[PDB]
């Protein structure tokens, strides 16, 4: 465990402004404390002028009732209104260095120690802690604590004794607090982790989301979602367990304080020390601090585990990159001529140190000449590309440019000076315009025109009906194959480098789309030196030299709470069992006050005897009603504590379920985005979790608190206008509040921060290509300007949520006074008594603080109405395709593998102006291979998507042994079909949990079986861990060929009888390409295959061969 940081740390992005409104915040939230108290003090001193010219003492009373209530008005308005802001300008702020200081960290540091989904959870739960540390509930800490303190100095003003022996409450619970928060940190670390790891599951589920389910995954994910949240919602159980500890012992001490001040005024007025008024007033100070410290619980509560949240975040705010960029002090060497050598260069990498990838590596790429690195798969080339663009510092060895150490000048320049295109092309959730324009970003339009026709991009942008402000993919996934990597190219291209790299530039291209492209790059590549990765012998032939690497050398109620009922109606006993207990507690609260204004009737008998027998009894009582509140406060906070955790749990579940039961065209689409799916799902339990979940306990117990102050207005028979005062704090909390979730349940514009937050994620999952191209200020300037409008929308919230706090407590005070002057009145007049005045007086006043307390849970509403719309807003939502209909047609053990297409018209959701297929008849004979050939943007993977109803054709008929697709399980028809993606990306676990995905269960002896057939088991073996290597976060610590591999025997352990495979023999050296192919045509004999290949030297015994030209029926015979 790590400890949390300081308190005033949480203060360290504060501004003049911030300074400003939190001093104004910090004035209201004591004036706002010290106003009941002395309110109360001063009705003490003002009984006698009352008593003693009616006009002008009643115009004056008036005139300075006005006074008083405009005063609280102003302070609990700013109490609330000024924190939030501060609170929120804060936060952001923190977001922004957070997002700042983790972008420009070393290359080595986000395989070791940081995900994505790490750096989301970050900037989301984590952020949200500390915002509710910042926000007003400081505010209303300073308000409880001011509280106190204005009673102990009332006290102390009306009998010093009983507040000095008041005075002593305040170690115990210092000690209770103090454990308390420690043990609540510890919990909510460990919670924090947990959930973390689950955010992790959600996300890395969500990118994936093809490969989900097309290997019918979502299961397996949603049982792995469910196992991480019954860590956290069991520690959330003991979170409860403790709190309600805490505040029955907080509660308890109160109490047992309560009744030795009790005792002692009675043996003060035994004596002639003080009189019945002082001890009066000094009960009130006293009740009313005690009762501050009861409700200071929740800022408490959420100090530590906000410090701890801090922790976690500065822990990445505070790191120093060990590459250390000589920004300051660099040589910037002035006129580059693009001499770059690799000198006895020794490098492990630091996830696998024991791994000499390379030793003493020389490499002398010349001034103006092109080197063809050939080589192995899994044996440098990408590596050395690492080692130029100072991805990591060479271990043992000498990178020089110009005969200048890397290390010695700073990357900013290099990396303006080097363009790369790296293996597997990174393209960002923006238009294809702003990905070329990463290159260059001050480019005039005409500049990126060019750059995409030399690129050979022209051709497929202008046909788009968007232009080039075309805004498809996450990861490019809206493009096909070819025009995400010549929009790369494009991108390296615009910025004109000294220094080219590419690797595997052209990988997979169509032929002549190929030629076009190499023979533009060396045209382009004429006077700027270029190392180029490429296993095709057209680039080779074009290269000056070429270098052999080998070994590592060369050669409301209706629609909200009654649904979650229903939905959460297994729990409606533990609720139950919390909800009595809230009720008792209210009780107590409220009898112990009648108890208390009891004794003060006591007092004034002359009768010692009698008198001490009463005080006496009377602290038996208050005794045990301690005890009793201590009991209850823990039941009723612990039974709260564990319903709230499975509601939480139990939401999540549904929502991860309904995400993932939606269709291809729900995740095509700018909002359903894996890092914004992500937030959306963790902002919203954790939402209905703090903002409801932990206030519904508080709620009741109010609640109870107020209807027994009524039912006992009731019974002990008292007059209209004291029980119409009594009524009305329940009114006003009940509109303010239902005014709140109304306004939190209608409108939001979250979707701002919600583009930052996957802005976030695609910046933190392209460390390298955000790096290469010098982007880390743009992704935070552009995270900046994301994060302004919910700031704005915060600043507005909080001023209505102030505005309803001031005048909710307005009308408590103002209703209150008049209370005070009536009964007076009714005094002096002796139309009533006196000591039933006092105790309905004082009840009201149990009841008002309670209604306060009520009323202080304004903004958790308002967010809980935000969460409660959102939920129910996704799970609402019905898919078009459903992953499994329960009537259909059987699908047959042994599936013959008749796969079809007639008449198919199709046209993607996102884009549906082009039309991709035009009655697109493709037939595939039982048991036989079928190749695919044509074009890049033919829609070769359109038909592979097709196959697997990811979408729907508009009116064609896809085919399934002579059956309609339609009509079968989607489930049950998906386990007999195994496909390879066409950029094989893997899970962030080993490399055996990543093949065992192919098959339910698969033993050991099938996953071996599957990785020789790939002839993949050698490197694996190789590995120091063996199956068990963790490969990365999207297989990024591994090589192409690898990771491609790893797919081809995922795909092969599936053992379907409809292998729909694709080109995935690119990536792969020409020998371990033969060898794949070799054992895929034994393995798939006997089995339909509807590989698509873009060399035709592949397609060597592919029977049938089928061209798509014009998106129609082309040639097929052969
Ligand atoms: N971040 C990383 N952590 C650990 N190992 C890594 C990492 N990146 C690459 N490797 C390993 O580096 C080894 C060789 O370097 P690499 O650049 O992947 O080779 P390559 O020859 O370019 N591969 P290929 O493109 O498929 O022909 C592979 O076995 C990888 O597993
Ligand atoms: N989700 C999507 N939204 C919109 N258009 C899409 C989407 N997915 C694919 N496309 C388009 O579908 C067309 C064909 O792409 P694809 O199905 O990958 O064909 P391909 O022939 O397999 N490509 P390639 O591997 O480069 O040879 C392209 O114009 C893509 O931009
Ligand atoms: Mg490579
Ligand atoms: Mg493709």
């Given at each position: 465990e790590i400890r949390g940081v300081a308190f005033k740390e949480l203060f360290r992005f504060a501004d003049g402004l911030d300074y400003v409104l939190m001093g104004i915040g910090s004035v209201g939230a004591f004036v706002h404390g010290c106003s009941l108290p002395l309110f109360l003090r001063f009705f003490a001193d003002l009984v006698n002028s009352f008593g003693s010219k009616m006009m002008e003492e009643v115009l004056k009373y008036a005139l300075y009732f006005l006074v008083v209530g405009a005063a609280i008005w102003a302070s609990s308005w700013a109490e609330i209104?000024?924190?939030?802001?501060?609170?929120?300008?804060?936060?952001?702020?923190?977001?922004?260095?957070?997002?700042?200081?983790?972008?420009?960290?070393?290359?080595?540091?986000?395989?070791?120690?940081?995900?994505?989904?790490?750096?989301?959870?970050?900037?989301?739960?984590?952020?949200?802690?500390?915002?509710?540390?910042?926000?007003?509930?400081?505010?209303?800490?300073?308000?409880?604590?001011?509280?106190?303190?204005?009673?102990?100095?009332?006290?102390?003003?009306?009998?010093?004794?009983?507040?000095?022996?008041?005075?002593?409450?305040?170690?115990?619970?210092?000690?209770?607090?103090?454990?308390?928060?420690?043990?609540?940190?510890?919990?909510?670390?460990?919670?924090?982790?947990?959930?973390?790891?689950?955010?992790?599951?959600?996300?890395?589920?969500?990118?994936q989301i093809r490969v989900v389910m097309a290997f019918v995954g979502e299961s397996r994910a949603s049982q792995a979602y469910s196992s991480a949240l019954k860590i956290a919602q069991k520690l959330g159980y003991k979170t409860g367990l403790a709190k309600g500890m805490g505040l029955g012992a907080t509660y308890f001490v109160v109490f047992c304080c309560y009744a030795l001040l009790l005792w002692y005024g009675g043996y003060l007025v035994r004596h002639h020390l003080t009189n019945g008024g002082l001890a009066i007033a000094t009960m009130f100070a006293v009740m009313i601090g005690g009762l501050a410290l009861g409700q200071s619980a929740?800022?408490?509560?959420?100090?530590?585990?906000?410090?701890?949240?801090?922790?976690?975040?500065?822990?990445?705010?505070?790191?120093?990159?060990?590459?250390?960029?000589?920004?300051?002090?660099?040589?910037?060497?002035?006129?580059?001529?693009?001499?770059?050598?690799?000198?006895?260069?020794?490098?492990?990498?630091?996830?696998?140190?024991?791994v000499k990838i390379l030793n003493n590596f020389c490499l002398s790429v010349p001034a103006g000449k092109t080197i063809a690195l050939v080589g192995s798969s899994g044996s440098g080339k990408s590596t050395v590309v690492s080692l130029i663009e100072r991805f990591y510092d060479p271990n043992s060895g000498q990178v020089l440019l110009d005969g200048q150490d890397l290390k010695t000048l700073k990357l900013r320049w290099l990396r303006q000076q080097i363009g790369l295109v790296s293996q597997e092309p990174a393209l960002f959730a923006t238009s294809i315009k702003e990905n070329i324009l990463l290159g260059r970003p001050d480019a005039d339009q005409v500049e990126i025109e060019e750059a995409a026709r030399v690129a050979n991009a022209h051709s497929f942008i202008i046909k788009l009906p968007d232009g080039f402000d075309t805004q498809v993919g996450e990861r490019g996934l809206q493009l096909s194959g070819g025009q995400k990597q010549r929009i790369a190219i494009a991108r390296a291209m615009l910025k004109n480098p000294a220094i080219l790299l590419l690797d595997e530039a052209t990988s997979a291209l169509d032929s002549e789309s190929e030629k076009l492209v190499q023979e533009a790059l060396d045209r382009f590549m004429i006077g700027r030196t270029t190392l180029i990765i490429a296993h095709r012998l057209s680039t080779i032939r074009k290269a000056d030299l070429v270098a052999v690497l080998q070994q590592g050398s060369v050669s409301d109620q209706a629609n909200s709470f009654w649904r979650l009922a229903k939905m959460n109606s297994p729990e409606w006993k533990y609720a139950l069992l919390g909800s009595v207990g809230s009720v008792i507690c209210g009780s107590l609260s409220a009898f112990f006050a009648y108890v208390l204004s009891a004794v003060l009737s006591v007092y004034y008998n002359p009768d010692h005897?009698?008198?001490?027998?009463?005080?006496?009894?009377?602290?038996?009582?208050?005794?045990?009603?301690?005890?009793?509140?201590?009991?209850?406060?823990?039941?009723?906070?612990?039974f709260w504590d564990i319903v709230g955790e499975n509601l939480t749990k139990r939401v999540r579940e549904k929502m991860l379920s309904?995400?993932?039961?939606?269709?291809?065209?729900?995740?095509?689409?700018?909002?359903?985005?894996?890092?914004?799916?992500?937030?959306?799902?963790?902002?919203?339990?954790?939402?209905?979790?703090?903002?409801?979940?932990?206030?519904?306990?508080?709620?009741?117990?109010?609640?109870?608190?107020?209807?027994?102050?009524?039912?006992?207005?009731?019974?002990?028979?008292?007059?209209?206008?004291?029980?119409?005062?009594?009524?009305?704090?329940?009114?006003?909390?009940?509109?303010?509040?239902?005014?709140?979730?109304?306004?939190?349940?209608?409108?939001?514009?979250?979707?701002?921060?919600?583009?930052?937050?996957?802005?976030?994620?695609?910046?933190?999952?392209?460390?390298?290509?955000?790096?290469?191209?010098?982007?880390?200020?743009?992704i935070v300037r552009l995270y900046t300007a994301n994060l302004e409008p919910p700031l704005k929308r915060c600043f507005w919230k909080g001023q209505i949520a102030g505005s309803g706090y001031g005048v909710a407590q307005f009308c408590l005070y103002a209703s209150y006074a008049l209370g005070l002057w009536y009964a007076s009145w009714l005094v002096k007049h002796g139309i009533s008594d006196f000591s039933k005045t006092i105790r309905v007086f004082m009840v009201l006043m149990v009841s008002a603080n309670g209604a306060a307390e009520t009323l202080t849970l304004a903004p958790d509403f308002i967010k809980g109405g935000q969460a409660m719309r959102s939920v129910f807003e996704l799970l609402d939502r019905k898919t078009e395709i459903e992953p499994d209909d329960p009537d259909t047609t059987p699908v047959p053990d042994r599936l013959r593998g008749e796969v079809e297409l007639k008449h198919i018209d199709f046209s993607y959701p996102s884009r549906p102006d082009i039309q991709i297929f035009r009655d697109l008849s493709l037939r595939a004979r039982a048991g036989k291979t079928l190749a695919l050939v044509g074009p890049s943007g033919c829609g070769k993977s359109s038909v592979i998507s097709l196959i697997q109803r990811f979408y729907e054709p508009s009116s064609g008929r896809v085919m399934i042994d002579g059956k309609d697709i339609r009509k079968y399980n989607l489930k049950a028809i998906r386990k007999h079909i195994a496909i390879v993606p066409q950029e094989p990306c893997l899970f962030g676990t080993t490399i055996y949990e990543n093949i065992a995905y192919g098959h339910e269960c698969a033993t050991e002896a099938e996953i071996i079986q599957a990785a020789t057939l790939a002839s993949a088991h050698k490197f694996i073996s190789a590995l120091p861990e063996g199956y068990k290597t963790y490969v990365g976060e999207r297989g990024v610590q591994l090589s192409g060929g690898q990771k491609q591999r790893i797919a081809i025997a995922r795909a092969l352990v599936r053992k379907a009888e409809i292998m729909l495979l694709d080109e995935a023999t690119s990536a792969l050296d020409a020998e371990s390409e033969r060898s794949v192919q070799e054992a895929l045509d034994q393995a798939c004999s006997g089995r339909t295959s509807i590989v698509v290949a873009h060399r035709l030297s592949t397609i060597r015994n592919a029977h049938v061969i089928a061209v798509i030209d014009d998106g129609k029926v082309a040639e097929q015979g052969s």
């Open positions: 209104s000024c924190w939030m802001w501060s609170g929120e300008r804060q936060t952001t702020k923190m977001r922004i260095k957070y997002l700042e200081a983790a972008l420009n960290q070393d290359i080595q540091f986000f395989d070791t120690e940081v995900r994505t989904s790490d750096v989301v959870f970050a900037i989301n739960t984590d952020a949200v802690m500390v915002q509710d540390a910042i926000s007003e509930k400081l505010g209303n800490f300073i308000h409880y604590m001011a509280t106190f303190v204005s009673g102990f100095i009332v006290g102390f003003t009306a009998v010093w004794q009983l507040a000095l022996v008041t005075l002593a409450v305040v170690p115990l619970i210092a000690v209770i607090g103090g454990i308390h928060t420690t043990t609540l940190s510890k919990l909510s670390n460990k919670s924090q982790e947990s959930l973390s790891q689950a955010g992790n599951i959600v996300e890395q589920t969500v990118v929740p800022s408490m509560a959420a100090f530590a585990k906000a410090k701890v949240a801090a922790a976690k975040i500065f822990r990445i705010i505070d790191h120093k990159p060990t590459i250390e960029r000589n920004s300051e002090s660099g040589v910037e060497l002035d006129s580059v001529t693009g001499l770059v050598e690799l000198k006895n260069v020794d490098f492990s990498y630091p996830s696998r140190p024991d005897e009698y008198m001490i027998k009463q005080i006496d009894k009377y602290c038996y009582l208050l005794i045990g009603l301690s005890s009793a509140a201590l009991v209850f406060n823990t039941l009723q906070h612990s309904a995400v993932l039961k939606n269709e291809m065209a729900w995740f095509d689409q700018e909002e359903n985005e894996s890092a914004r799916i992500a937030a959306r799902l963790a902002l919203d339990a954790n939402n209905v979790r703090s903002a409801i979940g932990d206030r519904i306990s508080v709620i009741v117990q109010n609640t109870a608190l107020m209807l027994v102050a009524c039912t006992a207005g009731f019974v002990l028979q008292w007059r209209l206008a004291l029980v119409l005062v009594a009524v009305f704090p329940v009114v006003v909390a009940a509109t303010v509040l239902q005014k709140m979730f109304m306004t939190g349940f209608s409108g939001d514009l979250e979707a701002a921060h919600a583009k930052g937050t996957q802005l976030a994620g695609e910046a933190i999952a392209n460390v390298r290509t955000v790096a290469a191209f010098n982007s880390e200020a743009k």
